[PDB]
Amino acid sequence: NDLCFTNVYADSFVIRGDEVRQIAPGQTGKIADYNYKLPDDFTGCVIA
Amino acid sequence: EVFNATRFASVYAWNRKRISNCVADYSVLYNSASFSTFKCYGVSPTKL
Numbered sequence A: 001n002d003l004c005f006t007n008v009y010a011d012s013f014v015i016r017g018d019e020v021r022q023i024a025p026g027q028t029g030k031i032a033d034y035n036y037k038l039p040d041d042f043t044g045c046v047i048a
Numbered sequence B: 001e002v003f004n005a006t007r008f009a010s011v012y013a014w015n016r017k018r019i020s021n022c023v024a025d026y027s028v029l030y031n032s033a034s035f036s037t038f039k040c041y042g043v044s045p046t047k048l
């Protein structure tokens, strides 16, 4: 709440079933490899 | 012949099959979606 940023982007999508945990930096799997890949130095948070 | 085996042994008497003197194609197990988890320690699954 105190810090400030130049821009923020909100990427919204739905995932069902297992692998929901795979949305995290440096993770492997069908979802992380073919569907949505996060950068190694990603700074932010994932809410589900 | 190991992964599509008819019946697996109990954990008290686990089986140990030795695989040798052959060409081992590891691409089928990696791309096949039939596995629920595939986590490798020591070596990366994509350079195998």
Ligand SMILES: *[C@@H]1O[C@H](CO)[C@@H](O)[C@H](O)[C@H]1NC(C)=O
Pocket (backbone or CB within 6 Å): B001, B003, B004
């Ligand atoms: C062995 O298992 C694979 C796994 O999909 C299957 O495609 C193949 O038909 C099976 N073969 C036999 C002889 O059980």
